[PDB]
Amino acid sequence: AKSLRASSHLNAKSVKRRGVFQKAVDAREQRISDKLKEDLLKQKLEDLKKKE
Amino acid sequence: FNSSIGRTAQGKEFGVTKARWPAKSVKFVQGLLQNAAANAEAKGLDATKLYVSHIQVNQAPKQRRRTNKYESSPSHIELVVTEKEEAKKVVRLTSRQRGRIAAQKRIAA
Amino acid sequence: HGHLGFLPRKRAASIRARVKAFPKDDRSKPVALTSFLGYKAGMTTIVRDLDRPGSKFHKREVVEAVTVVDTPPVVVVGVVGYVETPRGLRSLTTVWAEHLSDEVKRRFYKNWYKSKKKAFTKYSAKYAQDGAGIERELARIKKYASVVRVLVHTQIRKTPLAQKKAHLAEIQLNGGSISEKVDWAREHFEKTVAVDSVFEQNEMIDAIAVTKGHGFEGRAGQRGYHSRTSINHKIYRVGKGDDEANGATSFDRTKKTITPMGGFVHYGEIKNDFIMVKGCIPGNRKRIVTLRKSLYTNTSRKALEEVSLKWIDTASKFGKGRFQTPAEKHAFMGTLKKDL
RNA sequence: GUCGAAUUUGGGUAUAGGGGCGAAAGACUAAUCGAACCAUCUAGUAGCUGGUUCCUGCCGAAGUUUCCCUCAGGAUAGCAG
RNA sequence: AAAUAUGUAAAAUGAAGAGCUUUUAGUGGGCCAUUUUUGGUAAGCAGAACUGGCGAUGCGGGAUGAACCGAACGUAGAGUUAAGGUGCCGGAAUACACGCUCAUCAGACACCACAAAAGGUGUUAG
RNA sequence: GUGAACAGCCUCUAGUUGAUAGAAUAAUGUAGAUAAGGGAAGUCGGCAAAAUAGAUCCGUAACUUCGGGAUAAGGAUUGGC
RNA sequence: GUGAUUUCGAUUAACGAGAUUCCCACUGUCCCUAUCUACUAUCUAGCGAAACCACAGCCAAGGGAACGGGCUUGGCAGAAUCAGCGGGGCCCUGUUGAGCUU
RNA sequence: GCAGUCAAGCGUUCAUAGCGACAUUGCUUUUUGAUUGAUGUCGGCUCUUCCUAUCAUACCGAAGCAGAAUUCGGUAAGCGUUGGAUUGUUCACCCACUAAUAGGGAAGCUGGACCGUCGUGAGACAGGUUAGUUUACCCUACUGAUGAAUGUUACCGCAAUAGUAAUUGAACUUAGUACGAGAGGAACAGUUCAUUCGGAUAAUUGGUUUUUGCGGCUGUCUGAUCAGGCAUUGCCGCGAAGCUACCAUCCGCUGGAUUAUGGCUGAACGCCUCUAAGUCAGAAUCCAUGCUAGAACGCGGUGAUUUCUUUGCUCCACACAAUAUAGAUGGAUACGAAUAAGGCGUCCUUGUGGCGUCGCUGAACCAUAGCAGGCUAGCAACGGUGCACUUGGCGGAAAGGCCUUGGGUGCUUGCUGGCGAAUUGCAAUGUCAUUUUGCGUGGGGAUAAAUCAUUUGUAUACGACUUAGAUGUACAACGGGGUAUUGUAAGCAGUAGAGUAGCCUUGUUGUUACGAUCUGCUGAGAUUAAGCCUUUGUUGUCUGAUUUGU
């Protein structure tokens, strides 16, 4: 059987990873960043409520 | 005399890991301390300045029983408590050394 | 016998297991935390409606064990810069937030109740007139640091734990330039970061924790209480604390939270955000656990498939629990003697 | 295993070492019975094991011919005085 | 007919102790090597005779050591050397000179020994 | 008292409460137990454990020196009122 | 001297802390372990031995002759300790017969 | 192997004085493809490590290798390499199972000899002597656990080094395709499972019960009921929590450099050549990534650092002591790269440029005169240099140093003068450096912790670990509510109950006493953290001891 370190299956994994998997990763990270910005804005709005 | 005895957190005070609580030894030593304090009182020493200046334990003649040797290890103990109390060297210079000292003195004030 | 890579079988130096590798950074991406802190709060069972082409269980429903990790948002209280040297990474500067809660100030004491609680009182004096010293240290980090990590602490007072001392850790910041990382940290000083701004559902994460201790076992020696890093645990649900119907799915309309009847055993109810992770993770209930992002871009269809949960088991774990809610229990039993 | 006897058991009595006793086992005969224990002759017999007590100076080997039919053992030559 | 290799009898070199007669002690195994010789094995080798080494013997050297190379020993000082060495360990030339070699585990030795009969489009000189 | 019973178990009269103590409860050890599915696949070797077990009624083979084998084997039953 | 008895040297019921091969039943013997109880194991107070003991006590290679803990060359090497465990400590000589010959 | 056959060559040169590499009759032997296992003192299991002379898995080379399957070979030890029978334990061998069931090195229980006798074409004696010494509480190895010292104490880190892990089979699709008269029949890319091994885990299922939690049973005892004691866990059913199981569940990766081999360019050698210089790919290999430990004499970042313990602690200055120095005695004086090449200067049409010049040693360069360096008078120049300050930058690899601004203050040997030195007696280091630790002065600064003891159980043999505790959304003990376990409490009542007896208003629900059991009150009652959850209640507590300083 092909090993975990098998070069052919490693090349196949690399070419697969370069595509749809990485696209999913990038979209996920963008959404996570957007909701992190939303979280910061929410806390800053609570601080603004305190000031007001 | 601490081979294969237990470890205890109460050793940390003295930096050791092996300490015990020998009751019989403590009782004898504190009887001797009480006797020495009474002796100091009779001598008229100031009990607040007293510290244990000497203490010494050595081995007494062994006493046997049988039930193989089966002996005890008796002790002689002595101790002394003492009051704390607050608190020409000629030089042989050579002639050259004396001359150098004199030259220094003349060069200075 | 045994895997020789897990030698020596000695106790972990700390109860909080160390993260020894963060994901490789990509500067073009936005600033994100690589890791999060939580407390293990028991396990339960779910029914998943599986969509996995090729499998014999495609379009069929399976029952899975899951772990629930109680994750109230972490508080950002500091930043540390690292410079690379011919001898490795070296920390150059630590900058702290102006105010720190007693929750984190307890971490710096062995005997809190007896102390004058002077920790960071002289540090707070640096935020006095201009913040010039704080700004100089942040400028030093921006100029020389090649790696930036944020100091965060857990809000352990939000948990059911008897411990009042919060856990403090470094979390690597990935994405953005060094200056953008430092700006993000400075903006988030004394602010909370929520678990859903770090992770999201269907994502594969890694669990780092110290395992269950077993004392001396028969060569003989210490068994358990080792640091372990288990990888590829799928997130089945990122729940919200302020959300009723935490345990309700689209298929199960019963309005109920994630907490089982009678509470988790040896751990209270879940009143915060939580992570439901497929399978088991190292550690036992109440242990502090570190959740890390995947180190590599996973090439599995398992990392891609969406999770559709049908049902979450909220029966009592304190016996052979038969009822999901006390209302159901009452509706089954009927009217008891003390009801009249 | 045997458990009413070819049984178990107390006390008294008999049998003593070139022996006794023994449904006979070189079994047992007062903590080694191919033959008890105690004292004496007896400090019994040496092939042999182990040990063998101060200093310095000077001289200094052999580790082998021969005959006793040969092997132990002995004698004479050789070396050192 | 120069003599490898022993005897007899008479010039060289050396020698202060020699001969005889009485006496006294310890000793009574061998191992290793050279040389010659006779008989042998696939190969080792075996039987003799001689002469050395060791035994009773320290010291320098061969990193180390029963049989290898130097040299035998009162206590010291100075000088010079043996065998062996002189990048560093480590005292002493990373001296001088002419050549050869590049090894995908060179070589720095027992060798006028065994693998050794050869194979090579490595290199040098004939 | 139970019970066939000087068994085992509990009690009355009488006697004793002696054995160095205290604190913890990891592995191991010793003693005593339980266990899904399988059922000797274990081992030189079913070693050890397990299973059986009292009493009443029925029923009982080969072989036999006619006395036995025999509680052969194999079934049913057992409380309280 | 043989050892019941009978029958035809064989055979024999009953019995055996005697020997051997299987069967049912049974099972932690095992697949394959897991758990519970008690005393220990552990620490403390008191009491308190012994075996053994040239000195010591980390490894690798070398040190011709059972051979290395000590020598040579390297690896190394950091107070003081607790526990588990056991890896080490054919020809020659006589007699006698038996073949050949003047 | 025997005899040969000639000889490639050799033999003191010598062909059959003599040798002799490499190559060629006959063998168990008869032809047409008939019938023709050893091992007894070794062997089992477990289990570690190593070799490669590789059985399988990976990658290649060749072969009528069409495809499929196979054969032979090359690199390769990363990873594995069965369950049972067998007419003596064993291996041969059989049944099967598997990808395969390779061969070896190192390597704790266990299933004798001699002496002596009558005799000898010839047996016996059972006479006599002699030996059978390796079956943990110490040292050390290994595996875990503490720990003094580096001012104290606390938190967050780095990473030298050491170890290292994954494995094999199948299925879908590619496909009934390529290939083939047919019979048959692949693979890459894309998917999905399982095997062996490893690390965890306890939601669920199963096992386990001193939870003696609930219930039941026997015998005895407490007068009976109630409630209990004893039977060495009395026995039985269920049983949470905990522990735990291939008897349960989850997880176990990706980059460089290479081997064999296939090549590119290309000499040697005017052809040619994958090799010589150079260079492209390529194995389960190597090193990394990742994972575990973290040097207790490796390192970093950060927090707080004691008030009278009779001014304790700390940073500056002078003022004296003590300390001990792997070894001051003018200066560690900064490009980078190449070496079949460079440095410096200059110029242009600005570069792989033109011209000039340098090396051939640091033998240099800078410093360098003065009581171990005194006190004074001028000249020339406005330079050189030190000290205490100040301006503006720069340096994070271990920056801790480099450069610059301004004023003040000294010196100046760039030049000319004037005084002093003696006596250390003809040499004696003849004392001039810098580490640390104390004591005294005057100049400032800051006002903590840790440990024991108590407490928790995410920990635990002991240590160690982890929580909590001076007035609070504090902690504790009770109580309350949930959540679970068991299985319907005690008491009372009934016209339910095989019947038996007593009465008499001899029945067609006449009557009374006893009566195992049944029914209702009653999913009741009991237990429920000891390592379950929660709490507007009640009551209480909030403290002793020790030590640590640059």
Coordinates of C-alpha atoms (C1' of nucleotides) in Angstrom, one line a residue, chain H residues 234-450:
Chain H
rG234 C1' -24.9 -14.5 56.1
rC235 C1' -27.5 -15.5 51.2
rC236 C1' -30.6 -13.4 47.0
rG237 C1' -32.8 -9.5 43.1
rC238 C1' -32.1 -4.5 41.2
rG239 C1' -28.7 -1.0 41.6
rA240 C1' -26.7 5.0 40.8
rA241 C1' -21.5 7.0 41.2
rG242 C1' -16.8 5.4 40.0
rC243 C1' -13.7 2.0 37.4
rU244 C1' -13.8 -0.2 32.9
rA245 C1' -14.2 -3.5 27.6
rC246 C1' -12.2 -4.9 19.8
rC247 C1' -17.7 -6.5 25.0
rA248 C1' -18.0 0.3 24.1
rU249 C1' -16.6 5.2 21.2
rC250 C1' -13.2 8.7 18.9
rC251 C1' -8.5 10.5 16.6
rG252 C1' -3.6 9.0 14.1
rC253 C1' 0.3 14.7 8.3
rU254 C1' 3.3 17.2 4.8
rG255 C1' 7.8 19.4 2.8
rG256 C1' 13.1 19.1 1.2
rA257 C1' 17.2 15.7 -0.1
rU258 C1' 18.2 11.2 -2.2
rU259 C1' 18.8 5.3 -3.9
rA260 C1' 18.2 2.0 -8.0
rU261 C1' 16.8 3.9 -12.5
rG262 C1' 15.3 7.3 -16.7
rG263 C1' 17.5 11.7 -18.7
rC264 C1' 19.8 17.0 -20.5
rU265 C1' 24.1 19.4 -21.9
rG266 C1' 29.0 17.5 -22.6
rA267 C1' 34.4 16.3 -22.9
rA268 C1' 37.9 12.7 -22.3
rC269 C1' 38.8 10.2 -27.7
rG270 C1' 38.0 15.9 -34.4
rC271 C1' 32.8 9.4 -33.8
rC272 C1' 30.2 8.4 -29.8
rU273 C1' 29.0 8.6 -24.5
rC274 C1' 23.6 10.2 -18.3
rU275 C1' 29.7 12.0 -16.1
rA276 C1' 34.5 13.8 -16.0
rA277 C1' 33.0 19.9 -14.8
rG278 C1' 27.7 21.0 -14.6
rU279 C1' 22.5 19.7 -14.3
rC280 C1' 16.6 17.6 -14.5
rA281 C1' 13.3 13.9 -12.3
rG282 C1' 12.9 9.8 -9.0
rA283 C1' 11.7 4.5 -3.4
rA284 C1' 7.5 2.9 2.3
rU285 C1' 14.8 5.6 2.4
rC286 C1' 17.4 10.2 5.1
rC287 C1' 16.6 15.2 7.3
rA288 C1' 12.9 18.3 8.5
rU289 C1' 7.2 19.4 9.6
rG290 C1' 4.3 17.5 13.4
rC291 C1' 4.1 14.9 18.2
rU292 C1' 6.4 13.9 23.7
rA293 C1' 10.1 15.4 27.5
rG294 C1' 12.6 20.2 28.5
rA295 C1' 19.3 21.1 30.1
rA296 C1' 17.2 20.1 37.7
rC297 C1' 25.1 24.2 36.5
rG298 C1' 20.9 26.5 28.8
rC299 C1' 18.3 31.3 27.7
rG300 C1' 14.4 35.3 27.4
rG301 C1' 10.1 38.6 28.6
rU302 C1' 7.1 40.5 32.6
rG303 C1' 4.7 41.6 37.9
rA304 C1' 5.5 42.7 43.0
rU305 C1' 9.3 43.5 46.1
rU306 C1' 8.8 44.2 53.7
rU307 C1' 9.0 50.4 59.0
rC308 C1' 11.1 50.4 62.7
rU309 C1' 12.3 43.0 62.7
rU310 C1' 14.8 49.0 67.7
rU311 C1' 16.3 53.4 60.2
rG312 C1' 14.9 47.6 58.1
rC313 C1' 15.6 47.5 51.9
rU314 C1' 17.6 49.9 47.5
rC315 C1' 20.5 53.4 43.6
rC316 C1' 24.3 57.3 43.6
rA317 C1' 29.4 60.1 45.9
rC318 C1' 33.9 59.6 49.2
rA319 C1' 36.3 56.9 53.1
rC320 C1' 38.5 53.0 55.0
rA321 C1' 38.6 47.9 55.5
rA322 C1' 38.6 42.9 54.0
rU323 C1' 38.4 39.5 49.3
rA324 C1' 40.8 36.8 45.5
rU325 C1' 42.4 37.0 40.4
rA326 C1' 43.7 29.8 34.6
rG327 C1' 47.0 35.6 35.0
rA328 C1' 46.4 44.3 32.5
rU329 C1' 51.2 46.4 32.3
rG330 C1' 50.5 51.8 25.1
rG331 C1' 45.8 50.4 21.4
rA332 C1' 41.1 43.5 20.2
rU333 C1' 43.1 49.1 14.9
rA334 C1' 35.2 46.8 12.0
rC335 C1' 33.7 46.5 4.1
rG336 C1' 32.0 42.7 1.2
rA337 C1' 33.4 39.2 -2.5
rA338 C1' 37.1 36.7 -5.6
rU339 C1' 41.8 33.9 -5.5
rA340 C1' 42.7 31.2 -13.5
rA341 C1' 41.8 37.4 -9.2
rG342 C1' 41.5 41.9 -6.4
rG343 C1' 42.3 47.0 -3.4
rC344 C1' 42.8 52.3 -4.1
rG345 C1' 42.6 56.9 -7.2
rU346 C1' 40.9 59.4 -11.6
rC347 C1' 37.8 60.0 -16.1
rC348 C1' 33.8 59.3 -19.3
rU349 C1' 29.6 57.7 -23.8
rU350 C1' 28.2 54.7 -16.4
rG351 C1' 29.7 49.6 -17.5
rU352 C1' 31.6 42.6 -16.7
rG353 C1' 34.1 50.5 -19.0
rG354 C1' 39.2 53.6 -20.0
rC355 C1' 43.8 55.0 -17.6
rG356 C1' 47.0 55.2 -13.5
rU357 C1' 48.7 52.9 -9.1
rC358 C1' 49.4 49.1 -5.1
rG359 C1' 50.7 44.0 -3.0
rC360 C1' 55.7 40.4 -2.9
rU361 C1' 53.5 40.6 4.9
rG362 C1' 51.2 43.8 11.1
rA363 C1' 58.8 44.6 9.8
rA364 C1' 52.3 48.0 9.6
rC365 C1' 49.1 52.1 11.5
rC366 C1' 47.9 55.1 15.4
rA367 C1' 50.0 56.4 19.9
rU368 C1' 54.4 57.5 22.2
rA369 C1' 59.2 63.3 25.7
rG370 C1' 57.4 65.9 31.2
rC371 C1' 58.0 63.8 40.1
rA372 C1' 54.9 56.8 37.2
rG373 C1' 55.4 62.5 34.8
rG374 C1' 55.9 68.5 39.7
rC375 C1' 55.6 74.3 39.8
rU376 C1' 55.9 78.6 36.7
rA377 C1' 57.0 82.8 32.1
rG378 C1' 56.0 83.5 27.1
rC379 C1' 55.4 82.5 21.3
rA380 C1' 52.4 80.6 17.3
rA381 C1' 47.8 78.7 16.1
rC382 C1' 42.0 78.5 17.2
rG383 C1' 44.1 73.0 15.9
rG384 C1' 44.5 67.9 19.3
rU385 C1' 42.7 65.8 23.5
rG386 C1' 40.3 64.6 28.6
rC387 C1' 36.1 65.6 32.4
rA388 C1' 31.4 67.0 34.2
rC389 C1' 26.9 68.5 31.3
rU390 C1' 23.8 69.3 26.6
rU391 C1' 21.6 68.8 21.2
rG392 C1' 20.1 65.3 17.4
rG393 C1' 20.1 60.6 15.7
rC394 C1' 21.3 55.4 14.8
rG395 C1' 22.0 50.1 16.5
rG396 C1' 17.5 44.1 19.0
rA397 C1' 21.8 38.5 16.9
rA398 C1' 23.8 38.4 22.7
rA399 C1' 21.0 45.8 20.8
rG400 C1' 24.0 47.9 26.5
rG401 C1' 27.4 50.5 21.9
rC402 C1' 28.5 54.1 17.6
rC403 C1' 28.1 59.0 15.8
rU404 C1' 26.9 63.9 16.3
rU405 C1' 25.4 69.5 18.7
rG406 C1' 26.6 73.6 21.8
rG407 C1' 28.7 76.0 25.8
rG408 C1' 32.0 75.4 30.3
rU409 C1' 36.3 73.6 32.3
rG410 C1' 41.5 71.7 32.3
rC411 C1' 46.0 70.0 29.6
rU412 C1' 48.9 70.6 25.3
rU413 C1' 55.7 67.9 23.7
rG414 C1' 53.7 72.7 17.6
rC415 C1' 58.2 76.5 19.4
rU416 C1' 61.4 79.3 23.3
rG417 C1' 62.6 79.8 28.4
rG418 C1' 63.1 79.4 34.4
rC419 C1' 63.1 76.4 39.0
rG420 C1' 62.6 70.8 41.5
rA421 C1' 64.5 65.8 41.6
rA422 C1' 70.1 63.4 44.9
rU423 C1' 70.1 59.4 50.4
rU424 C1' 65.5 53.7 47.3
rG425 C1' 72.9 54.6 48.9
rC426 C1' 75.5 49.5 42.5
rA427 C1' 69.6 45.3 41.4
rA428 C1' 65.5 43.3 44.3
rU429 C1' 57.2 43.4 41.1
rG430 C1' 59.5 47.6 44.3
rU431 C1' 53.3 47.8 44.9
rC432 C1' 49.9 52.5 39.9
rA433 C1' 44.9 46.7 37.2
rU434 C1' 40.0 45.2 38.4
rU435 C1' 36.1 41.4 40.9
rU436 C1' 33.4 41.1 45.2
rU437 C1' 32.0 41.8 50.3
rG438 C1' 31.4 45.1 54.8
rC439 C1' 31.6 49.4 57.8
rG440 C1' 31.0 55.1 58.0
rU441 C1' 29.3 59.5 56.3
rG442 C1' 25.4 63.0 52.5
rG443 C1' 22.1 62.7 47.9
rG444 C1' 17.8 60.5 46.7
rG445 C1' 13.9 56.4 46.1
rA446 C1' 9.8 52.2 47.3
rU447 C1' 6.5 50.9 51.2
rA448 C1' 5.9 42.9 49.6
rA449 C1' 5.5 38.1 49.6
rA450 C1' 6.3 32.8 50.1

